[PDB]
Design a binder for this molecule. Structure first.
Ligand code: HEC
Ligand code: HEC
Ligand code: HEC
Ligand code: HEC
Length: 107
């Protein structure tokens, strides 16, 4: 593949909306975020019926949370994960690329 999204996409969850810009993640491979599905190309919602549908549960491969605030070991690369490694160089953006309160994610 589809065309790289231009207008920020909303990541509706429980009762909050966290906008996500693709530009910033234009260099980062799509395979990095958009992991293959059963060894097949996909581009459905991160929380599509069957997948990370659960937005409440914390742990679980079906939790939209476990695929965001999961710095531990996983099958793919998490956001907070990369970010952590990213800020690794710029610990001054940790309040943006990891910050819980007043972050590029949580406003
Ligand atoms: C993580 C840093 C990402 C990278 C790298 C790319 N995309 Fe992405 N994409 C990401 C998120 C968090 C979302 C929203 C999921 C949600 O449901 O909240 C998306 C969404 C898309 C879509 C929209 C899917 C739809 O419902 O129609 C498309 C078409 C898409 N992404 C394409 C795309 C391409 C082509 C990328 C590489 C060039 C790419 N994305 C990178 C996160 C990330
Ligand atoms: C993007 C860079 C994020 C950063 C940084 C942090 N979080 Fe987050 N969080 C993010 C999204 C996209 C969502 C919504 C998806 C969903 O699962 O609904 C969330 C949601 C939460 C929640 C709500 C889950 C619930 O309680 O049911 C909480 C409590 C939460 N996030 C906490 C949290 C903390 C403590 C963070 C710092 C370590 C943090 N978030 C960073 C994306 C991002
Ligand atoms: C169903 C078609 C899915 C969609 C859409 C997305 N993911 Fe996913 N993801 C899926 C499964 C079945 C699993 C578990 C792997 C297994 O052991 O079978 C995962 C895993 C992840 C992980 C790692 C967590 C783990 O269990 O190791 C992450 C970080 C992750 N997924 C992120 C992610 C993102 C960002 C998505 C949208 C861009 C996304 N997934 C869509 C199934 C599906
Ligand atoms: C590395 C593999 C990354 C992964 C995985 C995710 N993001 Fe990321 N993010 C990354 C970089 C390099 C940056 C910019 C920091 C810099 O080097 O200057 C970011 C920034 C963001 C932001 C900030 C918004 C903005 O500045 O416009 C947001 C909101 C963000 N990232 C969200 C996000 C989410 C939700 C991810 C998983 C769904 C995610 N990122 C993955 C690198 C990487």
């Amino acid at each position: 593949a589809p065309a790289v999204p231009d207008k920020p996409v909303e990541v509706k969850g429980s009762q909050k909306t966290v906008m996500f810009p693709h530009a910033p993640h234009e260099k980062v491979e799509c395979v990095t975020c958009h992991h293959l599905v059963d060894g097949k190309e996909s581009y459905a919602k991160c929380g599509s019926s069957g997948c990370h549908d659960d937005l409440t549960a914390k742990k679980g491969e079906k939790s939209l949370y476990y695929v965001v605030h999961a710095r531990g070991e996983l099958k793919h690369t998490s956001c907070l994960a990369c970010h952590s490694k990213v800020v690794a160089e710029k610990p001054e953006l940790k309040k943006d690329l990891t910050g819980c309160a007043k972050s590029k994610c949580h406003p």
